[PDB]
Amino acid sequence: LSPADKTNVKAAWGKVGAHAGEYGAEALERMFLSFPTTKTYFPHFDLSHGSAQVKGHGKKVADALTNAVAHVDDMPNALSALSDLHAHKLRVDPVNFKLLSHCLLVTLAAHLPAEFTPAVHASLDKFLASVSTVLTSKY
């Protein structure tokens, strides 16, 4: 990412803070309702509204994204283990990362309408695209 991109992402995710996991859970829920082809990857989950399993997984995703922002300059070594999990073991179709990235943007917009400028929208999209490239890099 460019210098301006780094600044807009760190700033936006700074002002997410403790809400990180709550936001992650909402993005998974928006994903499961809008794109029903993604429910097949979680047969061992209660995918009903308010589900405790979705809340706990929400926080795991959020914490993975917080590490990514904190290691923006060395992203393939901050997410190395999750490419193995996502590509080799689970065989997650690459389109699905684009569906989660989009629901994660619809969440940041509904909750942070003051920070969700068109320039910050563009910075977060390149950031989630980069995260998506690293997690599909074992294909």
Added chain:
Amino acid sequence: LSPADKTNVKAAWGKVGAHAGEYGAEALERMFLSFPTTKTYFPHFDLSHGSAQVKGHGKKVADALTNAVAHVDDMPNALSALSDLHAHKLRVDPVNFKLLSHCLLVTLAAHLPAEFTPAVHASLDKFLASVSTVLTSKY
């Protein structure tokens, strides 16, 4: 790219050799016929079969791919100027890098029957996808 993919790419591309320029001209011709939306990018070319200009541009595309093969480990710096031309100046829609990559695979299949195994097919797609990732990295 994995060491096995590097060996497979070098094997295949070694056998192309002196005909690389001819094959690049065939790929461009196959793309204009199959995906006629790609022609909007060459309004200053004669795009008839055997056009001097398409042969000329075939050699430029091929010489760049040979460079990319000789620098597989430092692709981002070998192609950085081509990344600027195609994103900043030309504004080429990323979907178009997938149509030209497919037309290259079709050209190599038709010329190198013995060399175009499943294993070699897969390594060449990864390589052309790697080349497309760099050329669209200013987005």
Added chain:
Amino acid sequence: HLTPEEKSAVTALWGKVNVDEVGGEALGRLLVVYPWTQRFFESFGDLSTPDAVMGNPKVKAHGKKVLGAFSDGLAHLDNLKGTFATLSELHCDKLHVDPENFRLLGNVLVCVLAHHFGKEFTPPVQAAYQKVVAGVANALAHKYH
């Protein structure tokens, strides 16, 4: 294909949409987030930076006409291929726009509805609109099939 309680939440929320601003908002964000789309719009003038694009009189004007085509599609959700026949011909035969871009504009609109409507834009509301924007996207792309 929307259920009665989907079609009623879709139509309910639209009546509260500032038809003037949201259209320009949606078109402006597409040009800044996916900069290759700018080459279709050269005559609109200065798209050099994010402020040049959002404050651009022709972008804001053209956005009213986009949102206005979205408004007519909701009314006729049972005949989109018909409503969008003339725009399909324009976008696919004259302009040569890759159908992947129809989906991206649909997805940028959803992000913008979420920006304005906030907590009123619920996950089940979003799933109903994601059905609308895909249906629009496929109606526009029919002249390629």
Added chain:
Amino acid sequence: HLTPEEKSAVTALWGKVNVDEVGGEALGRLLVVYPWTQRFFESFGDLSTPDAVMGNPKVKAHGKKVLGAFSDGLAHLDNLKGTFATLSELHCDKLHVDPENFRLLGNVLVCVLAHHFGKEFTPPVQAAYQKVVAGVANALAHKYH
């Protein structure tokens, strides 16, 4: 959507297709080149290496059914929505296969025809076959739209 000289080149080359082997070589190549697709064929057995996939007898057997479905498409080029309405339901509502993967199998089919026909698989012939595969992928995607 095929000129008269297109439809005649398409038909002429298809008649020479080894119906026993091409469908298995195409399905086998989809699974090796795009490995996420292997999760839908879990019960076909050993898909652990490239050599396991190509010689896997369930892959060859199912490869003949896929090619059969394409022959049926070529015979009904003017009504593809109607010929594939049952297969679309299987792939879309039961199996939950993303429509992008339909384009990938069609493009892999085009690579395999070029492998087998070499010089005969001319650019004009390839462009007639691309329209067909696009035709078939859009018909299999109909139950989403």
